[PDB]
Amino acid sequence: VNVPKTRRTFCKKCGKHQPHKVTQYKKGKDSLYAQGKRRYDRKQSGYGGQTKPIFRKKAKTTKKIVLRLECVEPNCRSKRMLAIKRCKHFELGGDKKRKGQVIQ
């Protein structure tokens, strides 16, 4: 699916519709020092094999695409994520498809 790089939508802090910068959010590093990671590293330390299960029954062939709305208006800089239905193709701000054009 195609979404533009710019979208004028609502902003929480200002309270008015303002233009926003559109980009795709990607998963960050686990940071190795979370409560669950520290709990899991202590539990897996020592003998006993492995304590928590490993999910190995994947069935989804896609992911829910997520945007990252950046507020372009200065001194606000409010970030937000908007959820869009599942798809396996995703690009930004290109090929507006030119309705009424050559098919070949």
Annotated binding site for Zn(2+): 11, 14, 71, 76
For the chain, state the CA radius of gyration: 21
Any contact of residue 72 with RNA (CB under 7 A)? no
Q: In the bound complex, what is the minimum distance in angstroms from residue 73's beta carbon to RNA?
A: 12
Any contact of residue 14 with Zn ion (CB under 5 A)? yes
Number of residues that bind Zn ion (CB under 5 A): 5
Contacted entry of RNA, Zn ion, none for residue 42, CB cut-off 5 to 8 Å set by kind: none
Concatenating the DSSP letter of every residue in 16-69 gives SEEEEEEEE-------S-SHHHHHHHHHHSSSSS--S--------SSB--BEEE
